[model samples]
Target chain A: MHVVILGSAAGGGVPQWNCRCSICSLAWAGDSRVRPRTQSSIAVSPDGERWLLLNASPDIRQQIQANPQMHPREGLRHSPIHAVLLTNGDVDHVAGLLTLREGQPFTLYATPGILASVSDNRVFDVMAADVVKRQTIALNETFEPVPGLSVTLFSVPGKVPLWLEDASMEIGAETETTVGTMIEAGGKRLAYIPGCARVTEDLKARIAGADALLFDGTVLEDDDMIRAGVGTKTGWRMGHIQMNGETGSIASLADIEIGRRVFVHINNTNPVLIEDSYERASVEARGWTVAHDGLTLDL
Target chain B: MHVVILGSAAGGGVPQWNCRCSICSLAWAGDSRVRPRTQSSIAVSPDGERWLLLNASPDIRQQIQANPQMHPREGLRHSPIHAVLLTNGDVDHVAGLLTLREGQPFTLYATPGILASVSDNRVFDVMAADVVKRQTIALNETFEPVPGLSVTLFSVPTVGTMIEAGGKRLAYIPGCARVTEDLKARIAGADALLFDGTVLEDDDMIRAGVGTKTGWRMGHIQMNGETGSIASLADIEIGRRVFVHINNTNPVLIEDSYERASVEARGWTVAHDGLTLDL
Candidate 1:
């Protein structure tokens, strides 16, 4: 199995267009020490030739271009992507699907809840329903989208995505709207939790023996957004699990033993994005690699 | 009124991700001669401060960055753009509305047909109906969305779009089957007409072995004869008629091509990204 980290930043990406925070300041100043990342998304494949995209960020066009393996081949107007699997219904997680509206056909996999969110409106009409096959799967049902990959969708502890907070999904956390993915390929197991409000025991036990884990690192603390002065909401309030402190994701995963551990979906304000900072150093000491854009690894 | 061409290319943009055609190839090479452009969208304002955006292209995030004037000011998350006006129902014309789900509020102006195309889905639900006001205007109604800016919506020969603002006007007409006398008059009245240049001739796409649909069949007037394309547009007395919404296969993109010279000789400029006009 091979994994390609297409993007690793949270919603607005590092140096989010509207932010002028400290880490964002480093990104805007051309600080090579800090690499600007697009929104978080990934692609994986059992065999390197055919890949299943995990999520489609709005930055997908540039992501595909930066990775040559994903580039379109000459002579045929075809794409290497076999299918797309959406983890949630967040705009940052799914808006890039519009970038493919030039009639590129690909099968889409999502939970019935997510499918409900995407299918609820005609705004997504650009990616016509008939042309693109939409398959709605039930939670915990493992399915093979490509020949050698098996992916199972499981509910995670999270509030409804912001867009659907009031209009729909007026439910408590741990609803079906947001989920974690347990992906298996070539006997290697990998778990991805890009968005989660908390680390529930069910989640920890479900992913306990996975070969590797890519967990949410959307904030350093619950008040990271409030402290930054850009927003009044806390991390958990926004369906993201904060990464540091005694009650944070890192402390929650300290007892687990995994072959590899990394943090994805990092918010720009999170000090961990500045690799050389004390925040990153501390997280690295806890045995987790900070995911970066275009980072690829063999499973 | 100051018009900043936020984006100038058509549908999928010049170097559209999936396309590897000549113009896209030139753009990919970063060749100085060929400028890369985003999908077609423009922002106009009577005053430079507050503005109205025309058509939300998929490349809106970058387009906003390219124009510092559109940037959100410090201390507030307010966008200078007051409202968004969509001309038609094409994906290129409306997909970027998804990017705004981060919750910047604005009024949307469109015909009922265009509104219906985007309204029914939860894809647009992200914008949340109440926060983002939707206003449907008829063919010949005139209203001022902002002070000092009187926008009159009229029918062009085709069903696409015919917007006249103040004394100086700009019109965008694509997705219409042909040109009519009313369209001819509208075209004759504008200071700048961002006309469709999707095909060089009627048989251009068919002979290129592209697909069965001819330019006319695709609701675009081909550049073949005087019905609607460039040659036919010469008789209209417009101030500055520019060609936009060009397809990748159109030979007019090449600077040295004879077709480009012939089209330019008729007093029309091919639109490019960052091209601005003051009216």
Candidate 2:
């Protein structure tokens, strides 16, 4: 398994134009202490020839340009991405789809709920149109992308306010067949929880022994963003586990003992971006590494 | 002082697609918890008639529509905006300038450094070549927009790494200028600090004691974007600050201040459309 971290920063990425925060200030200052970034996404390849992306980051154009392997073909039609596995339907995570619409013949793997969310948001309809194939995956259901690489979906209970319910899932659940699958590929287990209100015991158990885990890092604490008047609900209320404090994510999951614990979907406000900060060091000490663009891991 | 909060979020505005964050989650659930938002900008009018905007917000079209007073005059040779005052030359603050340049003439105000920054970024040269007017304001120089409104340029240290001479005195100052020297002659004293910084990290405007308001919470600027990120600046000054150039993920876009309360406690103010005040 070869995984590349496309973009490291949270929603707005680093040096958010309108922000005057310390990180942004440091970035604006061009301080060597800080590195600018973009929304998060990852690409995994089985044999280093054919590449599959985990999420289509908003900065996909730039992200792909940074990678020599994913270089565009003539007229920008040649894309190494054979398929895309979406974790959710947020604009930052999915807006880049519009840029790739011209790259024909790509597969999109997502849950029915996520598909409906994208359709309702009008992003998919506006960007992909009919050129791309939309494949629906159920929670815990497994499917193959390329002969040896199989992907699965896991339905975590949490919805972005912008998305609507999946008609198929809403109906399927009435018959008790609603299942959101977790992805497993290449004899290595990988868990993706882009958004979750709380990390339930079942969820913790599912992701416990995975080879790699990409989880939410939206806030440093429950009230971190709320204290800034950026939001009302705590990180846990919004489906993310806080990274600090006694009741925080690092504390809760320290015992789970995953081999490679990577924090994904990090918010721009999260302190993990700052290496010098205690928060960042603490997370690192707990065996977590901040994800960054172009970071490649070979398994 | 009539102020408009262009965008009120961190990076992505409310209803961020693919977002399962608490704010996005609430908005998706139709919880009546979220408010629509765009990138940040502000408009000020002394007489409550003619208006001059501080920054050209990403959602300028919609923000203008919401303000009948700021609406453009039909068939007018130029746009309704008497002039535009730029704090810095970033993408969210300047991208909306493209929307304003449709056969409309408007004056732009910024420091020489800022003008060069925008030019270097190719934001200024692309303005139809002839339609846009770029005016460089010397540090500590005050210029009048109209009769009652006058703005004085103060050197606020800000960071800019991409530009050459990035280490000059004006290179990376974090705070806006203080109202020093000849306070009475100035038209508006501390009208608004359409400053940057998205998170509550140490350098946020509120943390620096620059002002209580922010460009994000009220809807003027965004934290995380294609050009930059959000951090402590967003967290430190919520109420006094109104976020702008907002992306779709920020929680402040929600109707109530789950984010607002956080900042308001510190005396920060959020910007909003149709918010007017007499200087």
Scored by DockQ, the top model is: 1
Clashes of each: 7, 124
Q: Taking the tens digit of each residue's C-alpha lDDT, what string does model 1 give over B41-74?
A: 8888887777888888877867776676676655
Stretches off by above 4 angstroms in model 2 are A73-76, A121-123, A126-130, A162-183, A226-233, B1-279
Taken in order, the candidates have interface RMSDs of 2.5, 18.2
Query: Which whole-number lDDT from 0 to 100 does residue A140 have in model 1?
Result: 91
lDDT of each: 0.77, 0.55
Best by lDDT: 1
Candidate 1 CAPRI category: acceptable
User: Please, what are the lDDT tens digits per residue for candidate 2 over residues A25-84?
Assistant: 566566776776767787777777677877776566556645655653332234567888
List of chain B TM-scores, one per candidate: 0.90, 0.62
Worst 10 residues of 1 chain A by lDDT: A163-172
